[PDB]
Each structure stands twice: as structure tokens, then as C-alpha cells.
Amino acid sequence: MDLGASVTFRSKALGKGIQQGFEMKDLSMAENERYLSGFSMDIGYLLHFPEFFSLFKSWGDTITILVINASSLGQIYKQMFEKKKGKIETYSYLVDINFEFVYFKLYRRLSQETTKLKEERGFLLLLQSPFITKLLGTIRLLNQMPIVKLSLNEVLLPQLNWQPTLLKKLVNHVLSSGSWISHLIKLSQYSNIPICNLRLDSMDYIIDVLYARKLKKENIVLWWNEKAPLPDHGGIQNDFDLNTSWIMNDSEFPKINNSGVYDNVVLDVGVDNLTVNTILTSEFVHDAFSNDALNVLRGMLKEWWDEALKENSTADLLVNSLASWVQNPNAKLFDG
Amino acid sequence: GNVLPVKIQPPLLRPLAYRVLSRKYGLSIKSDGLSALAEFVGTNIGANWRQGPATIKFLEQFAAVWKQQERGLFIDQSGVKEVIQEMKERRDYFKVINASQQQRFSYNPHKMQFIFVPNKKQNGLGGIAGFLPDIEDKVQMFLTRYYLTNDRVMRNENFQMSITPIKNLLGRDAQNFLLLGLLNKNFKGNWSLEDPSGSVEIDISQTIPTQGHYYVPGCMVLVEGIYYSVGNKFHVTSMTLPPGERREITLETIGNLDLLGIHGISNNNFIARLDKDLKIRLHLLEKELTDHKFVILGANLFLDDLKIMTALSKILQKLNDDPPTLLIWQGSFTSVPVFASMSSRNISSSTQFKNNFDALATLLSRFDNLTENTTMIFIPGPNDLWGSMVSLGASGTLPQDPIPSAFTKKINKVCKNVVWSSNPTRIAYLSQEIVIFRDDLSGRFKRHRLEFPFQKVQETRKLVKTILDQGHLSPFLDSLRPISWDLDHTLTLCPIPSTMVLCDTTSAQFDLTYNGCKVINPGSFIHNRRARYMEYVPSSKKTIQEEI
Amino acid sequence: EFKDPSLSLVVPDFLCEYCFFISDIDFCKAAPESIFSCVRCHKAFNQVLLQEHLIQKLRSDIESYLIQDLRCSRCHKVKRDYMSAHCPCAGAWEGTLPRESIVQKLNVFKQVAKYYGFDILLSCIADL
């Protein structure tokens, strides 16, 4: 939060400070982050579909799947090749081709392949499985390199003809990883967040980071919480209190219905962006929320609205996801 | 029958059965009894109808077994069951019970006697909603607690001076008195004492309290002071919690009532008591007690992290050689409370909770001796499935539900003896009463201590003295810990238990004893790069071990 | 005399991940093939999420019933003391939340869970 990805030194003992751990509290600062890096470097790919462990190399030319298939794989790859020619062309500078197919006692080869890639390149890893923690804890080599997780879980088998659907899944993932990484680098170089710490559906995380740093420059305690969907209050929040109980379960919304037969014309309208307009527009009471945080959040939302007006897709997505972040207790810095 | 059974004619055997069962002892022989006796004279064909003593003595043994069950004027299809008992009459005897199936007993202030209360399930339908308590239950819960405390106080040797009800303090002033009741904050925000008669105010500016107690709102207190009618202030000068009593003295007031009835129970029709087999079971327990050991672990063994699993595997490696009699795991089994998941992209928290116990079944596969010889006990933690669904990890209802069956469909099949109970659970040994209760105590009593205007082993002494003198597991009002209206009797310490398994993750380990009872204070399952668990010898001795 | 031939069981603040649509869904009055899919975007819903939300609603209902206040029958003033037999005036205490209301609510949970395939909700009922 305080330092960010844009790291630099102002020592003006660098060797002595890198043989051991460089201390940061005395010397730290964040530089500008308009462009993170000009990326030209390999990628890795390890995937799992609940025994469907899969691997692929950007600079490799073979595909082997752990325990008719080859022809279907080739034809499907070619088909989606012509159907996404444009996307492949525009993301070739990120990831670039037919590759050898293989369908492979066999469960120890993950360690061998990880070691082989370890000595073959220094290549970011993309992970896609419902058991990311299990894979990390059963392959000791995976902690030795930076990795980016793309968990899209809840994938199941149709009990029949799983080969075509799984082929479609793997090929679309392979040919959409370029767009994925383009979007990820956009979000990272926009929000000053490291690549490995990001995720496609972690909108709440950026909200937390930006709001937390804006409060840190302010004189407001963060009430930051981890591994618990409750605001931090010094431990008092563990106790049961009546008013908290009633504000937790007060979730019903009223409505108006006036029955009858109407001969006059009636128009049907829809109302949208209600919550954002409600937020932006507008001692004695103990149940009131802090005024300072409310003002800061209103200003942040206003600047996001202004930036999204000036053709920023990321700001638009943030504005759309703000309400879902507010409702969701899983997000950190959440207060009922 | 015998090796050579001969089918009888019922009319000719009728006189032999009828005489014994209708003139000496017993009454109203049915047809089922006669048919049974036909079969079991087939089992006694030896010279019978010409051999008296054998069949007659079998019949008198039958009567001596039958007449101890209810009144037994009729012989239904149980007769074959008592005959199987006769055949079988020619470690067990211990029970574990939860707060859900504890018998209800009211207390009457006008009759000074406990009164049995029928359970809603046994007599009611219970198919739609039978677990919902009635409205007056919460009205009478505090009345029951106050009545029990009043009786306990007035049974004391020193008190034979007498207290005065609150309402009798209106007409006097400048006179010292003595009184007791609930302590709380009035609507205005002042300190008040509440009694069934009424309530008054408290002056604290010159109070000298008895040290060693956690003076907390919701606790019975004895107040000595001077009334003043100029305002409404009862100027307090001294304050002390009521004293406690041992098990035998409180028991003898009701002889030995069948509260935790294993040998026999009482119900609406009759009241039952027993002391004859108490000494026999005490003598039985005095022997081979070292062989029947039960070991408990720490609190909050999260089944998600690798370190806890590795330590648990090492513990089971040491333990599988010598399986104990009972094994208890206490605390939460998941480090994060389970609740509504707003995203379907990732693993559902309920599915993760189901997955965590599945691996435990796999780890049981390599410790077959433990799985075969030792029963297993699981006690829910603060942020397990049902509570965290609405409490979200905070304190909630105390009579907590057991672990749901749908998430434990494999542990029951691998192990042969697993029991899930409520957070407060009571087991009945041969001559011992053991209770287990898992929650946070030291922090609660530290944060809510009353303030008085004016080495860590002393804190646990104060905690034990307070919890044992109050005589209630939850000396807190309905504001702090909401309690189900009817089940409050489960939390009562009426005839205090032999041993208390009081686990608090915020307190150091202790093995103290006081007032005929002893208390064990297990800590967290792990601490400071180490893990520990404790075992208690039924001979009033404790051991501590650490395996990292 | 005409009456309503059906009851209501509404879940508030239901969220769709794909469209961020917020609406209250009725489990009883609403027609089929609309509980399982979002209104604007025609994407199927997760089912164990529905079961979990129903269970959470039921448990919050039970807790709210159990933590209710007491009101005097004659004068509607509220109970202000921990132990007391009745109001200083005439009248006996009654609960703010009547029992028959929650009994009917549980009945309709039972009917809803029986109509569709809802097994964890049935287990939640069974533990009572």
C-alpha cells in the first residue's frame, strides 16, 4: 500500500544492503508508474480440469496431457485460429502456431516438468485449477519463481463426450491468455499494483488499496482486517450487541402497489445508477457512520466518475463494481 | 426349547402359571405371558409337570426381575426381552449427553423442591416445530435463577443475619440492611439492583469490595449498606459474592435425586432416588482406572493449514500404539467462519468445509488401532457452520447445535464411535460428573470488570472462584449472550460437577481444584512454534505433554 | 370470499456476478425458469448459493424471533425490567413476534424445499 510496485533507492552500502535484507523504513519512496515495463519475456502454463493436468510452453512446440483426439485438437485449434486471427495478431507481441499433441506412475512428472522449466528459463506461470493451494503445496519448485494465478474454478465433466468440451476450454484459454495479460498489464500500470498480486475479478482489492492509501495520507485509522469479514475495532467487535444485530439483518426494502383498473395511459420506466447518485448527492447519534470517511469516499467516487467520463474503461469498471464491493462482506475494510 | 421339546396344551399349564402369578405375587397374567411360559417350559422339559422346584424358582426369579420395572400389572411383548435378561443374568455404564436431551426440572419457591417438567418432544408431536420455547419461559428464567441462588444462600451456616426484600426498604432510613439480586444498568444509566419485589439505586463512592472476584453485571451480589430516603441511594460499604457448597451437602438436601439418570430416571408420575450402588460403582472405579484414560487436545485445531495437520499426524503416530478410552477435539475446525459466498467463480465455503473433514477420514486410515479402540468426540467452536452463518464469528447462542450430519458423512463410516454434542456437554461416568465448555472467558471478564473509586496464577484463581460461587456458566445478561429460553437449565451448576473441562484460548494452562471440584484449563492447540495437549488421570492427577 | 391462493417468500438483495444486477427474488409467487436465471442477462444461477441464502434467511429469522422484546397487552408500553410478573397496570406480557407467524414461515420453507431439489436445506430442517 505505502510503497507500491514502483520501487527505487536513494541511498546516495548497496552491496552490503543486498547481501543482507535491505531495510526500507529509513529509505523508501514510490516513483511514477505511467508505464510499468516494456514486456518481452516468456510465459508458462499449467492447467487442471477435474486427471486432466495440462501444460503448455510459449517457446515449446509440444502438448502432453496426463491420463481421434489429435485430429480433433488440430482442427479445433486451426478453427479458432481463423476465428480469432485479429486478436491473435494484436496480442502476438504478448504471446504467439501448431504444436505436437500427446495424451499420456504418471503423476510424478509434474515435479520433473517444473524442474525442467526451472533450469530452462528464469517465465511467468499461469495457474488455473480449483486446487491452487494444493498444487502449490505439493510442488516445492513452484515457490522459486514469480507466478500469476488465474483461478476460474467450478469446472465439471458432462459424463459423455468430455473431449470436445475440454478441447474447447483449453484452446480458448490458450488463445485468450494474450487478452488476459493485456488487460492485467493495463490494470497494473493503471493502479500501481504488481502483476502477481492482481486477478481478473479482484475489483474489491483495488478499491481497498486506493481507499486505504488515501486514508493513510489522512489521519484516519484504517480498521484493516484480514481473514475475517468483520471490521477491526480492537477486539470489541467480537462481542454480541443488539443494535449491531438489528442493523445486520435489516435487509428488506419497501415498495408501493396501488391496484385498480386504469383507462389513462401508463408509461413504464427504468431507474439505473441509483446507488452512485445517492452516494454522490448527499457525537449525538452513536449509530452514525464516520463523516470524514464518507466525505473522502464521496470525493474518490466523484473523481472516478470524472475520469470515467474522459474515456477510461478501468474507471468505468470500478464504478460498476463499487456497489458489489459495498454489499459484499468478503471484501476487506467492510463495515455493516 | 430343550433338546427334546414337547409342545404343551395351554389349559393344563394354566393352573401352574396362574397360581404363582395371581395368588402369591403378581397379577393379571395375559395370553402373551402364557405363550412365553409355554416356550420356556419347552426350554425346561426335564421331568416337568412332575418336577416342581426348578420351574418354580425360575418363575420367582422372573417375578424378582419383573416387579422392579414400573408396576407391571400386564405382561406385553417385553416378556421375551426379560427372558433374554434371565438368560444373560445366569468399559460400559458410562454415558455422554448433550444440552438438547437434558431433562427439564423446574424449581418452586413455595414448595422448596425441584419439579420435573415433561419434555416437549416426548409428549408433543414435534414433527413441525417443537423446539420453539414459549413466551413466558424468558419471564421465568431469571425467576428460576434467583430462586436457586436464594435457596443456596439461605442454606449457608453463617446465615440463619437475614436479608430483606427490596420493596420493604421504602419506609425506613438511616438503618443498615442486607440484600441481594441482579446487578445491571437502569434505563437512565445508573447502577441498580433488581429483585422480584423491586429495584433500587446504588452509591459506589465509598465501596470496599471483597477481592478475588470478577464483579460483573449479571452476577448475584450481597450488598450491605445504609438506605437514605432523601434521594433513593443505598450507600454501599461492603460487597461480596455469595459462598458456594460442595456436591454432597447440596445432594443430600434432595437425598440423591436422579438428575443425570443413568441407573434410573424420574418423570411426571413419580420421583426416583438411588444411593445403594453409588459406593459399589465408586469401588469399581477405584480399580483399573489407570487403564481407562481419556486424553483431550487443544482448542481451535484448524483443518486447513499444513502445520496443524503435520502436528496432528505426529500426535496420532505416538497415540496409535496405545489407544485411550475417550478422545476429545475442541475448538473450531476451520480458521475462517463460513457464510454466504457472493462469487460462484471459486470454491464454495460450505464445500470447502465439507472437504476439510474428508481429508481427516483419509488420515484416520493409517491409525487403525485408534479408530478401532478409542471413541471420538467433537465439540463445535465459535465460528463453525451454524453459528457463523448468523454470528459471523462473534459470540452467539450458547446452546449451540451439533455439527450437521450432511457435512460428516464419512467420519461416521470410517470410525466406529463418534459423538457430536453441543458446546456445553455433560458425560456421566461410573462415579464422576464431567462437563466440557469451550468459549472465551478471561477477555470477557477483563473487559466488563466493574470499576471501584479509591503472578498470573491469581487471575485464574479469581476466575475459578467467580464461576464457582455464581453457579451459572454464563453470568451475563441477555444483552451480551442470548440464550434459548428453555435450555437455560443446561447451563446451571446445580450439584456442581466433579471435574470441569474449562477451555479458554485467552488463559494459560491450569489444574486447580476448589470446593470439592477440580478445573482443568487447556490452552490453544498450538503456541509459540509448539503444540501441546493434556491428559487427566481419573485418580485426580494431571499430565502435560508437548511434541514439537 | 376471495383470498390470495398463495403465500410469499422473498429473498432481498440477490446479486448476479455477470451483470451486477440487484433485485429481490420471490421463491413462491415467481414462475419457474426465472428463479434459476438473471432477469437482464440470461445466465443460469448457482444452486448451492440459493440453498445457502435460504438457510441464512431462516437462521436470521429464528435468531430475530429469539431476541424479540416483550409488550404489555392492555397498554402497549414495553417491558423495562428483567424479572417481573406483569405490567404495573392490568394486562399480561405478550411477545412482539407471534409464534404462529414463524410456524407458518417454517411451513412454507418446508413446502418450497419439497417442491424442488433442495437437500442441504432439508438437512438444515432435520437438525431441528
Ligand SMILES: [Zn+2]
Ligand atoms: Zn445478471
Ligand SMILES: [Zn+2]
Ligand atoms: Zn400494561
